Amino acid sequence: VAGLNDTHAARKTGAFQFLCAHGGLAGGVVDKTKNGPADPDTGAVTVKVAQ
Amino acid sequence: DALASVDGNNAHVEGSRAEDGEMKPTVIKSNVTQILRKVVRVSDTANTTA
């Protein structure tokens, strides 16, 4: 935010799949093949990919 | 600064090679005008901020 003109890069928001439980990213996106982390409060997992 | 009637001396007989003024007027002066500017360009990303 100095006297320079741009000094900034691309910006993005927090996606749906990224805000709930991003149990591992495959790059710029959440990995759609890994279950989320166990909630320490109760031990729950809101992201489960069963086989 | 015309002042074509300086005190000096005073003697005239209505002629005899009258003082024959030497174009005291048109000593006009002059000057130039300056230009000032400045820009308030707004950054591209750091914009629309509260």
mmCIF file of C-alpha atoms in Angstrom:
data_model
loop_
_atom_site.group_PDB
_atom_site.id
_atom_site.type_symbol
_atom_site.label_atom_id
_atom_site.label_comp_id
_atom_site.label_asym_id
_atom_site.label_seq_id
_atom_site.Cartn_x
_atom_site.Cartn_y
_atom_site.Cartn_z
ATOM 1 C CA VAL A 1 0.000 0.000 0.000
ATOM 2 C CA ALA A 2 3.038 2.219 -0.583
ATOM 3 C CA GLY A 3 3.419 4.886 -3.265
ATOM 4 C CA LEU A 4 3.738 2.102 -5.839
ATOM 5 C CA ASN A 5 0.859 1.657 -8.265
ATOM 6 C CA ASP A 6 -0.389 -1.949 -8.162
ATOM 7 C CA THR A 7 1.830 -3.991 -5.802
ATOM 8 C CA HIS A 8 -0.906 -6.622 -5.754
ATOM 9 C CA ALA A 9 -1.827 -9.995 -7.239
ATOM 10 C CA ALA A 10 -5.010 -11.932 -7.951
ATOM 11 C CA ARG A 11 -7.580 -12.274 -5.171
ATOM 12 C CA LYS A 12 -10.128 -14.996 -4.446
ATOM 13 C CA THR A 13 -12.810 -15.733 -1.871
ATOM 14 C CA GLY A 14 -13.447 -18.618 0.501
ATOM 15 C CA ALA A 15 -15.369 -21.258 -1.415
ATOM 16 C CA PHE A 16 -18.091 -23.516 -0.036
ATOM 17 C CA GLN A 17 -15.947 -26.664 -0.105
ATOM 18 C CA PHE A 18 -13.074 -24.631 1.385
ATOM 19 C CA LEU A 19 -14.924 -23.042 4.321
ATOM 20 C CA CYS A 20 -16.527 -26.148 5.846
ATOM 21 C CA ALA A 21 -13.551 -28.517 6.156
ATOM 22 C CA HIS A 22 -10.703 -28.368 3.620
ATOM 23 C CA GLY A 23 -9.115 -31.711 4.430
ATOM 24 C CA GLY A 24 -6.227 -31.254 2.017
ATOM 25 C CA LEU A 25 -5.898 -29.186 -1.157
ATOM 26 C CA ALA A 26 -4.981 -30.543 -4.594
ATOM 27 C CA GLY A 27 -3.680 -27.134 -5.682
ATOM 28 C CA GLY A 28 -5.984 -24.133 -5.867
ATOM 29 C CA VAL A 29 -8.960 -26.329 -4.918
ATOM 30 C CA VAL A 30 -9.946 -28.645 -2.081
ATOM 31 C CA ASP A 31 -9.110 -32.307 -2.627
ATOM 32 C CA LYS A 32 -12.358 -34.172 -3.346
ATOM 33 C CA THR A 33 -10.968 -37.567 -2.272
ATOM 34 C CA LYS A 34 -9.923 -37.024 1.370
ATOM 35 C CA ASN A 35 -12.185 -36.980 4.411
ATOM 36 C CA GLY A 36 -12.098 -33.955 6.675
ATOM 37 C CA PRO A 37 -10.434 -33.739 10.062
ATOM 38 C CA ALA A 38 -12.066 -35.065 13.203
ATOM 39 C CA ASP A 39 -13.797 -32.250 15.065
ATOM 40 C CA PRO A 40 -12.093 -32.004 18.487
ATOM 41 C CA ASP A 41 -15.305 -30.702 20.071
ATOM 42 C CA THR A 42 -17.291 -33.909 19.500
ATOM 43 C CA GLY A 43 -15.207 -36.056 17.141
ATOM 44 C CA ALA A 44 -17.392 -35.576 14.063
ATOM 45 C CA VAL A 45 -16.457 -35.376 10.380
ATOM 46 C CA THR A 46 -18.665 -33.319 8.060
ATOM 47 C CA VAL A 47 -16.661 -34.413 4.978
ATOM 48 C CA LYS A 48 -16.652 -38.180 4.373
ATOM 49 C CA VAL A 49 -15.840 -39.892 1.071
ATOM 50 C CA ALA A 50 -16.603 -43.579 1.548
ATOM 51 C CA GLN A 51 -15.784 -46.426 -0.854
ATOM 52 C CA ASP B 1 6.889 55.156 -15.099
ATOM 53 C CA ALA B 2 6.239 57.720 -17.811
ATOM 54 C CA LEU B 3 7.123 60.866 -15.814
ATOM 55 C CA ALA B 4 7.801 62.931 -18.928
ATOM 56 C CA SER B 5 7.678 66.185 -16.901
ATOM 57 C CA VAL B 6 10.842 65.815 -14.799
ATOM 58 C CA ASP B 7 11.751 69.012 -12.941
ATOM 59 C CA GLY B 8 15.141 69.600 -14.547
ATOM 60 C CA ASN B 9 15.104 73.134 -15.927
ATOM 61 C CA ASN B 10 12.264 75.337 -17.182
ATOM 62 C CA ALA B 11 12.830 77.745 -20.080
ATOM 63 C CA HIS B 12 10.870 77.974 -23.331
ATOM 64 C CA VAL B 13 9.896 80.701 -25.789
ATOM 65 C CA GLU B 14 7.255 78.674 -27.634
ATOM 66 C CA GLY B 15 9.591 77.249 -30.266
ATOM 67 C CA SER B 16 13.349 77.243 -30.899
ATOM 68 C CA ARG B 17 13.558 73.464 -31.367
ATOM 69 C CA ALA B 18 10.936 72.426 -28.827
ATOM 70 C CA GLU B 19 11.861 69.559 -26.499
ATOM 71 C CA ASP B 20 10.808 67.018 -29.164
ATOM 72 C CA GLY B 21 9.738 64.190 -26.857
ATOM 73 C CA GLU B 22 11.573 60.879 -27.242
ATOM 74 C CA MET B 23 8.625 58.463 -27.082
ATOM 75 C CA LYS B 24 8.465 58.253 -23.298
ATOM 76 C CA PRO B 25 5.417 55.917 -23.520
ATOM 77 C CA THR B 26 5.453 52.296 -24.743
ATOM 78 C CA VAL B 27 7.957 51.169 -22.124
ATOM 79 C CA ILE B 28 5.504 48.330 -21.562
ATOM 80 C CA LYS B 29 6.594 45.376 -19.417
ATOM 81 C CA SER B 30 5.479 41.743 -19.493
ATOM 82 C CA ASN B 31 5.775 38.367 -17.782
ATOM 83 C CA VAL B 32 4.900 34.711 -18.275
ATOM 84 C CA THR B 33 2.286 32.443 -16.672
ATOM 85 C CA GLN B 34 3.173 29.191 -14.903
ATOM 86 C CA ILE B 35 1.171 25.961 -14.956
ATOM 87 C CA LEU B 36 0.815 23.649 -11.957
ATOM 88 C CA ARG B 37 -0.631 20.142 -11.903
ATOM 89 C CA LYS B 38 -0.715 16.943 -9.864
ATOM 90 C CA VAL B 39 -2.444 13.566 -10.031
ATOM 91 C CA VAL B 40 -4.364 11.631 -7.383
ATOM 92 C CA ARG B 41 -4.364 8.280 -9.209
ATOM 93 C CA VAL B 42 -6.003 5.492 -7.196
ATOM 94 C CA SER B 43 -4.396 2.060 -6.982
ATOM 95 C CA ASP B 44 -6.043 -0.837 -8.806
ATOM 96 C CA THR B 45 -6.313 -3.338 -5.934
ATOM 97 C CA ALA B 46 -6.123 -1.026 -2.889
ATOM 98 C CA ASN B 47 -9.380 0.639 -3.902
ATOM 99 C CA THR B 48 -12.972 0.753 -2.662
ATOM 100 C CA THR B 49 -11.745 0.305 0.918
ATOM 101 C CA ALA B 50 -13.416 1.475 4.120
#
